[PDB]
C-alpha cells in the first residue's frame, strides 16, 4: 500500500526510541506521515508510531535491528 500505520524504522530495521510524543510527531511528519506519537508499549516495545507513512520510508518489520 502507498501508506501505512507502523513503527518508522531506519535502514537497519531499527525503531526510533522516544521520550516525547512531540519527538515522534515531528519525526513522522517530516518523513511524509500525517501524524505520530510515542509508543512506550507496543508490538516491538518503545518506539515512534506513525500514521499514514509513505512506503518509500522504512517501517519496523519482523527480524532483528542490525
Curated annotation (Swiss-Prot):
Subcellular localization(s) per the UniProt record: Secreted
Reported tissue expression: Expressed by the venom gland.
CC per GO annotation: extracellular region
Highest taxon above the source species: Eukaryota
Effect of substituting residue 36 to A: 38-fold decrease in toxicity to mice, 11.2-fold decrease in activity on Nav1.5/SCN5A, and 43.3-fold decrease in activity on insect sodium channels
GO terms classed as biological process: defense response
Consequence recorded when altering residue 12 to Y: 2.2-fold decrease in toxicity to mice, 6.8-fold increase in activity on Nav1.5/SCN5A, and 1.8-fold decrease in activity on insect sodium channels
Domain commentary: Has the structural arrangement of an alpha-helix connected to antiparallel beta-sheets by disulfide bonds (CS-alpha/beta).
LCN-type CS-alpha/beta domain: residues covered: 4-66
Keywords on record: Cardiotoxin, Disulfide bond, Ion channel impairing toxin, Neurotoxin, Secreted, Signal, Toxin, Voltage-gated sodium channel impairing toxin
Consequence of substituting residue 12 to E: 1.7-fold decrease in toxicity to mice, and 0.8-fold decrease in the binding affinity for insect sodium channels
Role noted for this protein: Alpha toxins bind voltage-independently at site-3 of sodium channels (Nav) and inhibit the inactivation of the activated channels thereby blocking neuronal transmission. This toxin is active against both mammals and insects, and is classified as an alpha-like toxin. It is active on Nav1.2/SCN2A (EC(50)=139-252 nM), Nav1.3/SCN3A (EC(50)=565 nM), Nav1.4/SCN4A and Nav1.5/SCN5A (EC(50)=195-500 nM), Nav1.6/SCN8A (EC(50)=214 nM), and drosophila DmNav1 (EC(50)=30 nM).
GO molecular function, one term: sodium channel inhibitor activity
Something else known: Exists in two forms, due to cis-trans isomerization at 28-Pro-His-29.
Effect of residue 30 to E: 4.1-fold decrease in toxicity to mice, and 14-fold decrease in the binding affinity for insect sodium channels
Family according to the record: Belongs to the long (4 C-C) scorpion toxin superfamily. Sodium channel inhibitor family. Alpha subfamily.
Mutagenesis / variant outcome for changing residue 45 to A: >47-fold decrease in toxicity to mice, loss of activity on Nav1.5/SCN5A, and 56.7-fold decrease in activity on insect sodium channels
Impact upon substituting residue 64 to E: 71.4-fold decrease in toxicity to mice, and 170-fold decrease in the binding affinity for insect sodium channels
Protein's name according to its UniProt entry: Alpha-like toxin BmK M1
Protein species of origin: Olivierus martensii (Manchurian scorpion)
Amino acid at each position: 500500500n502507498s501508506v501505512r500505520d507502523a513503527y518508522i524504522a531506519d535502514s537497519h530495521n531499527c525503531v526510533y526510541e522516544c521520550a516525547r510524543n512531540e519527538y515522534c510527531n515531528d519525526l513522522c511528519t517530516k518523513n511524509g506521515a500525517k501524524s505520530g506519537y510515542c509508543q512506550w508499549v507496543g508490538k516491538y516495545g518503545n518506539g515512534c508510531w506513525c500514521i499514514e507513512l509513505p512506503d518509500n520510508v522504512p517501517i519496523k518489520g519482523p527480524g532483528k535491528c542490525h
